[PDB]
Amino acid sequence: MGHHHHHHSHMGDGEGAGVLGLSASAECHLCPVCGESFASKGAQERHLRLLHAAQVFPCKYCPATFYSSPGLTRHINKCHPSENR
């Protein structure tokens, strides 16, 4: 009895464009290869898959990006076993 979730998951909150009058953001999401404060989580992922993609290994058929070399092939073997193109 008392099976309950604490689901306060509300990730986002940020719409706008322009300059900045103050540093803003915080150490919430960091691109693991360069210490740089991202508020948005997609901002962390994009700084990897574009620039800092040497350290991270993306299983090419899906956007599931690994942070290790064995994990790369382990998707294609286990969780993506139709994809040998």
Ligand SMILES: [Zn+2]
């Ligand atoms: Zn980076």
Ligand SMILES: [Zn+2]
């Ligand atoms: Zn995959």
